[PDB]
Amino acid sequence: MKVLALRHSVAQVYADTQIYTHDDTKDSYENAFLISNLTTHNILYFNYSARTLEILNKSGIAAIEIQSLEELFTLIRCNFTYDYENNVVYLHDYSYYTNNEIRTDQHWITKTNIEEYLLPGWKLTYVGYNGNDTRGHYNFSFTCQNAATDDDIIIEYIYSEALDFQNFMLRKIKERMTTSLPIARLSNRVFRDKLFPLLVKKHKRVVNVGPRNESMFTFLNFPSIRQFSNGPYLVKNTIKLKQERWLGKRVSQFDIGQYKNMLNVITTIYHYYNLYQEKPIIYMVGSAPSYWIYDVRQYSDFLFETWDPLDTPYSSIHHKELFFAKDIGKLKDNSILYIDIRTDRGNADWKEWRKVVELQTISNLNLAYQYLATGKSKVCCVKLTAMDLELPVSAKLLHHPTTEIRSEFYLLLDIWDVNNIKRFIPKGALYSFINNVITDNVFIQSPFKIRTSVSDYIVALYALSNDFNNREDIINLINNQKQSLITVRINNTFKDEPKVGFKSIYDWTFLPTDFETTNAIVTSYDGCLGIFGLSISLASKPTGNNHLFILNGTDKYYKLDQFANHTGISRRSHQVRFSESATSYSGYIFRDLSNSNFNLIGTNVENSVSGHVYNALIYYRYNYSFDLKRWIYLHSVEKYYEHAPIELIYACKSAKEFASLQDDLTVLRYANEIENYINKVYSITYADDPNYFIGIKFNNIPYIYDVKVPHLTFGVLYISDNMIPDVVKIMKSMKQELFGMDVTTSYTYMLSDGVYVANVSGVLATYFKMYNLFYKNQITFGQSRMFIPHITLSFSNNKTVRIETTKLRIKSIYLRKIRGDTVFDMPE
């Protein structure tokens, strides 16, 4: 939506493409609301106060100050993510292709030969995390940087099994200039970066579920988190594999040895974090060039100590040019040891040189056992060729990709992988692992058992919703659990399909109303950006991979008009009402017809009902950022605004009817889901065949009438005959809000056959309060019909006569017994 707030005396409207203008000082909250229901994508907000920007930025709507026009305004056009507490703009613009470069955020790729393999004239540069080395280009009122990088192209290529690179990047560079900016995917690495370091301090613990190599680096300075994912591959499960022979396969023009050397270490550490909640010393041998070190130090600071003949530019201590051979007792315990002692064949005979590779492998294991023989908290990660070896069963294999597959895989070990566990593995049982099994993830820790906990702050962002997880176990994990941040997918389709996918995998799909939480928000992506200190410039789409977010047990459940609020509620309706092929009164006509006020749709300008909810139900696909359920519970019990209980049912009933004609079975369910939850948090009682009624007499009715005493039957009630004395409290306590309300009549109509009446206006708000006042005193009031206030005139069938809006005022009020000869109260 991208609100751009411009200087009062310096501000221009030009022939732009998606620009509305807004300017007012009516209210801070009410102005932001009126903005947030505006249609277009780019809005100029000419005279402003900081609090109207606060509310929007809190609502996930990116709203920012603009002080100048030449570059501060033209470059903040493009889409972005805004941290509204440190005033940093994370742009997501792929217009940097124009000066003919790609850009990464990993230093190691710059030292490859890749620029030989890019298209002619292109380069890569500006290597910083989130583009934090972009900010040197711009000089604004705010800090700014373009976090768009092409990590996708390079990393997918490695996992792509394709060999021509120019063909590859030319394909993908054309995909972005064709298809939609995946803004939600890009904004997550921003979200993840600030999401954890504050969460860790606030709760003192955290568990994450399903981390992928999106987060290879997020957690390197967080030992005290415990991540769970797909389990590892074990030596225990090589016995499955059919035998196979050397397969010389090349899948990368440019050498990516530094990438696996980075991943195998990183895997080794998250393992060490899994076992002990501490973080190690990191010894190394055989790995000099190590341009992947500087990538690591941008996140967490580790002590790297290396033994290699060649240059290690990036380390604390490069101890020797000798490679660590048997001086093994000189190592500290709190450690990991990464062994990559290797060789390179020259032109020597492969059949005889193979003998050398076998002997190193025997040695490299002897180093591993002697390491793990003495001290505790020691992990290894050792180099192996594919030959017959005696390996521990419970150990974990790794084959992160490389330049080319030529028979080697790495093994990592723990202290208990030595304690009397050993198996013999044949040769071709390893090649069968090498050649077909690519390791996908450095996070090889055990799966998350789906059950509630009370010490755990559980995060689960894109791990659950998979079809293979028990639906009810995740539901109960969400309902019967405090302390979390869970994400699940919304049922964004019609005909209520419970499982939705890509023709590869299906995922479980939810509505908001699957969950009877106790104190929790259930909002969208943009809403939770606001909760955690962020705001985004692009709105969510009605279809596509939208996801419910669920915050349990948080400080922000009571702060309703701040976060996950009624912002954005009517944005799509206003499009339908005025523009997209309908009359402006379409919603004002339908809901009265569907609630049996179909004779009268004149007074549907004002005094209609079913405001917030009817929009929340039929356009949930757009505005599920508004947690409807949280809105209702906090008005059951006053913890601004107030509507009667009755109005919410009519909002539900009309959405059913609407979804029936449309045949949108998902709204139709969602309407059923709500209305019996409305009848849950509070009951509703109906004096269907009442005994008493509240009546209002007037001085003079400016109409023709044959009924001997015209009156307004203001409401009916069914009570016991000694709760009269506490009914009369209410008439007495609000006698002037009835004498003081603008009763007006302007016309006659036909309420029904043989019942010719007037219309009364301007009274309902008092009627809705009166229903609430009687309610909590446990007094029945009102019928299941819609109370349309009317003054009876005659039992005939006549013509609607219009007069000027003539004010009527109150003779008296009275509480009358139906078919009785006496009353007991009448204010005056």
Ligand X SMILES: Nc1nc2c(ncn2[C@@H]2O[C@H](COP(=O)(O)O)[C@@H](O)[C@H]2O)c(=O)[nH]1
- Looking at 77, 226, 482, 499, which residue binds a copy of itself (CB under 8 A)? 499
In the DSSP assignment, the letter for residue 298 is T
Judged by CB, which is closer to a copy of itself: 309, or 498? Answer: 498
**Phi and psi of 816, rounded to 5°?**
-115, 145
Nearer to ligand X, 131 or 789 (CB): 789
Q: Name residues contacting a copy of itself, limited to 214-253 (CB under 8 A).
A: 236, 239-240, 242-243, 245
489 or 643, CB closer to ligand X?
643
Name which of a copy of itself, ligand X, none residue 752 binds, using a CB cut-off of 5 to 8 Å depending on partner kind: a copy of itself
Q: Are 412 and 379 in contact (CB under 8 A)?
A: yes
The binding track of 613-652 with respect to a copy of itself, each residue x by CB under 8 A or -, is: ----------------------------------------
For residue 308, the minimal CB distance to a copy of itself (Å) is 37
CB 587 to ligand X: min, Å: 8
| CB-based contact 260:401 (threshold 8 Å) | yes
Distance (Å, whole) CA 519 – CA 526: 20
Closest CA to 421 of 389, 395, 387, 383: 395
| Catalytic residue (one of 403, 452, 685, 713) | 713
**Binding marks (x or -) toward ligand X, 518..557, rule CB under 6 A?**
----------------------------------------
CB of 543 to a copy of itself, least distance (A): 20
Query: Of a copy of itself, ligand X, none, which one sits near residue 689, judging by CB under 5 to 8 A according to partner kind?
Result: a copy of itself
Comparison of 498 and 820: residue with beta carbon closer to a copy of itself: 498
Structure tokens that stand for 779 in this block: 């007094």
Q: Pattern 703-732, binding to a copy of itself, x per CB under 8 A?
A: ------------------------------
By the rule CB under 6 A, 227 interacts with ligand X: no
Q: From the list ligand X, a copy of itself, none, which binds 570 (C-beta under 5 to 8 Å, kind-based)?
A: ligand X
> Of these partners, ligand X, a copy of itself, none, which one is at the site of residue 239 (CB under 5 to 8 Å by kind)?
a copy of itself
Of positions 416, 578, 598, 795, contacts a copy of itself by CB under 8 A: 598
Distance from the Cα of residue 666 to its chain's centroid: 21
First to last CA, the chain: 54
**Phi, psi (deg, nearest 5) at residue 824:** -140, -5
In angstroms, give the least distance from the CB of 689 to a copy of itself. 5
Neighbours of 688 (CB within 10 A): 12
- Least distance (Å) between residue 192 CB and ligand X: 35
The three-point CA angle 624-635-680 to 5° equals 80
Is 615 annotated as belonging to a binding site?
A: yes
Site for a copy of itself in 355-394 (CB under 8 A): 393
Q: Which residues pair with 3 in a beta bridge?
A: 43, 63
Least distance from C-beta 621 to ligand X, angstroms? 19
> Whole-number minimum distance, CB 617 to ligand X, in Å?
16
Report residue 822 CA to chain centroid gap.
Answer: 62
Cβ neighbours for 499, distance < 8 A, ≥ 6 positions apart: 467, 506, 507, 508, 509
x/- track of binding to a copy of itself for residues 758-797 (CB under 8 A)? -------------------------xxx------------
Residue/partner pairs of 177-186 with CB below 8 Å, 24 or more apart? 177/94, 177/97, 181/79, 181/92, 181/94, 181/538, 183/79, 183/81, 183/92, 183/536, 183/537, 183/538, 184/525, 184/540, 184/545, 186/81, 186/92, 186/147, 186/148
Is 423 annotated for ligand binding? no
Strand-pair partners of 285: 307, 339
| Stretch of 159-167, 253-261, 288-296, 418-426 lying at the interface with a copy of itself (CB under 8 A) | 418-426
Listing DSSP states for 241-284 in one string gives: SPP-----EE--SS--HHHHHHHHHHHHHHHHHHHSSS--EEEE
Q: Residue 198 binds what, of a copy of itself, ligand X, none (CB under 5 to 8 Å, by partner type)?
A: none
Which one from 22, 41, 319, 711 is the annotated catalytic residue?
Answer: 711
Residues 6+ apart with CB under 8 A from 264: 338, 381, 398, 400, 410, 412
Among 641, 661, 708, 736, binds ligand X (CB under 6 A): 641
Work out whether 37 is an interface residue with ligand X (CB under 6 A): yes
Q: How far apart are CA 480 and CA 453, in angstroms?
A: 9
Q: How far is the CB of 817 from a copy of itself (least distance, A)?
A: 16
For residue 687, what are the CA distances in angstroms to 161, 755, 781?
Answer: 73, 22, 6
Site string for a copy of itself, 460-479 (x = CB under 8 A): ------------x-------
Which parts of 393-412 interact with a copy of itself (CB under 8 A)? 393
598 binds, among ligand X, a copy of itself, none (CB under 5 to 8 A by kind): a copy of itself
Annotated ligand binding at 591? The verdict is: yes
β-pairing, 499-501 vs 88-91, is unpaired
For residues 361 and 359, give the distance between their C-alpha atoms in angstroms, rounded to a whole number. Answer: 5
State yes or no: 643 annotated in a binding site. Answer: yes
3-class SS of residue 615: helix
The footprint of a copy of itself on this chain (CB under 8 A) covers a number of residues equal to: 24
Window 565-604: contact mask with ligand X (x via CB under 6 A): -----x---x------------------------------
Query: Residue 730 Cβ, how far from ligand X at the closest point, in Å?
Result: 22
Residue 57 counted as an annotated binding residue = no
Give DSSP secondary structure letters for 121-175.
Answer: T--EE---GGGTTSGGG---SSEEEE----HHHHHHHHTS----HHHHHHHHHHH
189 is known to lie in a ligand binding site: no
Strand 88-91 and strand 143-146: pairing?
Answer: parallel
Map residue 364 onto helix, strand or coil.
helix
Would you call 389 helix, strand, or coil by DSSP? strand
Q: x/- site string to a copy of itself, residues 543 to 582, per CB under 8 A?
A: ----------------------------------------
Q: Select from 753, 804, 821, 828 the one that contacts a copy of itself (CB under 8 A).
A: 753
Integer Cα distance of 490 and 512 in angstroms:
8
Contact call for residues 475 and 516 (beta carbons, < 8 A): no
The residue (of 558 and 795) whose beta carbon lies closer to ligand X is 558
The residues, any chain, with a CB within 8 Å of residue 559's CB and separated by 6 or more, are none
What residue 245 binds from a copy of itself, ligand X, none (CB within 5 to 8 A, per partner kind)? a copy of itself
Determine how many CB atoms are found less than 10 A away from the CB of residue 445. Answer: 21
Within 246-285, which residues bind a copy of itself (CB under 8 A)?
A: none
Is residue 428 a contact residue for a copy of itself (CB under 8 A)?
Answer: yes
With CB under 6 A as the rule, give the number of residues binding ligand X: 6
CA 715 to chain CA centroid, nearest Å? 45
Residues, the chain, total?
A: 828
Note if 711 is an active site residue: yes
Q: How many other C-beta atoms can be found within 10 angstroms of the C-beta atom of residue 430?
A: 27
Q: Are strands 484-490 and 547-552 parallel, antiparallel or unpaired?
A: antiparallel
Q: Which residues are annotated as a binding site for GMP?
A: 574, 577, 588, 591, 608, 612, 615, 643
Q: Which residues are annotated as a binding site?
A: 574, 577, 588, 591, 608, 612, 615, 643
Task: List interacting residues with ligand X (CB under 6 A).
Answer: 37, 570, 574, 611, 641, 643
Task: List interacting residues with a copy of itself (CB under 8 A).
Answer: 236, 239-240, 242-243, 245, 393, 423-424, 426-428, 472, 498-499, 596, 598, 688-689, 752-753, 783-785
Active site residues: 711, 713, 790, 792
